[PDB]
Amino acid sequence: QYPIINFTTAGATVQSYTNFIRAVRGRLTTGADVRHEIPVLPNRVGLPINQRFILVELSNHAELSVTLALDVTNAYVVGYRAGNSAYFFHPDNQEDAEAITHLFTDVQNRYTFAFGGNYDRLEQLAGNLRENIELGNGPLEEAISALYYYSTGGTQLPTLARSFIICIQMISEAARFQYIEGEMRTRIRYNRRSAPDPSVITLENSWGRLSTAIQESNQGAFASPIQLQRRNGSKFSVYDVSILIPIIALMVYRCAPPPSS
Ligand SMILES: Nc1nc(=O)c2ncc(C(=O)NCc3cnn[nH]3)nc2[nH]1
């Protein structure tokens, strides 16, 4: 049965959140596949169902808990459980539709949302963009409560979507990028919430293209440079994998690696 990582916003310190992110990366990647020192997530093709997900049990100071399911192939939050109900984002394809049946299997009340969980959708539903949604231990504490009270009608759909946007970035994006992990640690250290600045938003937006560029690179070198933003929104060209080693922690599997040469 699928591995669970626990995290609580109640204790929270930079140490406990680091321990949390590090254990999520640890269950996401196997160590089989590392390219230019960056781990690659498992290939979805031929990945057996018993290896497909991880679970992240989130608790909060209000004594509630909720369990998110992450897909190990892309680190995406696919769904969540709170007590007796589970909800899943609308699947992209038939294979994902079947795969999600293997989650939360004894829950009474299982629902699939009619909408997908990509940021663009969540952001319409929330009536707010990532750039205007504050992140930190307080947002997370409140996201946990919001997800936990959805089934009883207590949480409005825009707050639901906002709450996922919070969880996705604080968990899946932080697992993807050391840089994003460190942004969160800052928020937790000073106990202040704040919205992600362009340096975070551009990394999130670029994860898939960065993954492809790295895996397609010639000995590290990008065929086409990729534009990121710094905190003040200015351009930063990435020409090479080397500059990303302290920034990106995990990549999505695009292709088998070429023979080392
Ligand atoms: N539930 C969920 N979990 C995630 O971990 C996640 N990560 C990135 C994006 C996103 O829209 N990223 C940009 C993108 C662009 N095209 N597809 N995705 N959405 C997500 N949603």
Side-chain angles (χ1 to χ4, degrees):
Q1 216 297 305
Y2 303 119
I4 290 166
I5 303 98
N6 307 308
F7 175 61
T8 185
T9 51
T13 57
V14 315
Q15 202 56 73
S16 57
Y17 173 74
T18 303
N19 295 340
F20 169 50
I21 295 307
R22 277 183 187 161
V24 176
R25 296 196 182 118
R27 293 294 182 175
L28 287 176
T29 45
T30 65
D33 188 351
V34 179
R35 308 190 205 176
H36 306 96
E37 306 153 45
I38 303 160
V40 179
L41 293 168
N43 190 357
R44 167 219 318 289
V45 184
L47 182 63
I49 191 62
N50 68 286
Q51 287 169 210
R52 182 63 133 102
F53 303 108
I54 63 161
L55 304 166
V56 172
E57 199 181 284
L58 292 178
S59 311
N60 81 355
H61 170 66
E63 273 295 331
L64 299 177
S65 53
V66 109
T67 308
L68 310 174
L70 282 70
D71 193 323
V72 123
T73 62
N74 54 17
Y76 264 56
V77 177
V78 299
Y80 86 101
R81 213 217 349 242
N84 201 23
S85 301
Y87 299 84
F88 309 87
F89 295 119
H90 175 235
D92 293 339
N93 57 60
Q94 296 192 299
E95 292 78 42
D96 297 343
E98 197 285 339
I100 58 161
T101 74
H102 294 75
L103 261 355
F104 299 140
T105 178
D106 30 324
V107 85
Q108 157 183 313
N109 320 302
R110 154 185 225 96
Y111 305 96
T112 301
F113 289 131
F115 53 88
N118 285 201
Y119 290 138
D120 53 7
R121 196 72 175 105
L122 290 181
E123 278 175 334
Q124 304 157 20
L125 295 164
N128 279 118
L129 298 178
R130 284 170 286 154
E131 29 277 85
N132 299 132
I133 297 173
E134 297 172 318
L135 301 173
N137 199 57
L140 190 63
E141 162 82 39
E142 298 157 8
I144 292 163
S145 288
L147 295 214
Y148 169 97
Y149 288 111
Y150 187 72
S151 74
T152 57
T155 128
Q156 282 33 274
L157 176 69
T159 307
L160 186 72
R162 182 195 179 100
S163 298
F164 284 133
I165 290 167
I166 293 167
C167 287
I168 292 153
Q169 298 175 80
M170 289 193 77
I171 301 168
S172 303
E173 301 289 13
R176 303 176 175 125
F177 297 94
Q178 298 99 128
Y179 182 80
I180 290 178
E181 173 201 354
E183 291 285 301
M184 300 306 107
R185 291 207 288 242
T186 299
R187 293 159 169 73
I188 296 159
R189 193 184 313 275
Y190 304 109
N191 189 29
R192 39 130 208 186
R193 60 180 72 197
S194 46
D197 74 21
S199 75
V200 178
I201 290 293
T202 286
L203 285 172
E204 294 176 354
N205 289 347
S206 299
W207 182 63
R209 271 164 327 237
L210 293 159
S211 290
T212 311
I214 291 166
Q215 289 173 44
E216 298 276 5
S217 71
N218 291 110
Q219 313 163 337
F222 286 15
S224 296
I226 277 176
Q227 312 306 147
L228 298 185
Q229 291 162 43
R230 303 198 206 88
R231 291 196 188 276
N232 66 8
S234 67
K235 168 182 69 57
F236 182 93
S237 306
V238 186
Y239 291 103
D240 204 273
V241 65
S242 65
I243 210 75
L244 307 163
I245 307 301
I247 291 152
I248 183 165
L250 300 176
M251 294 178 283
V252 59
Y253 184 94
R254 305 293 202 205
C255 42
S260 28
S261 296

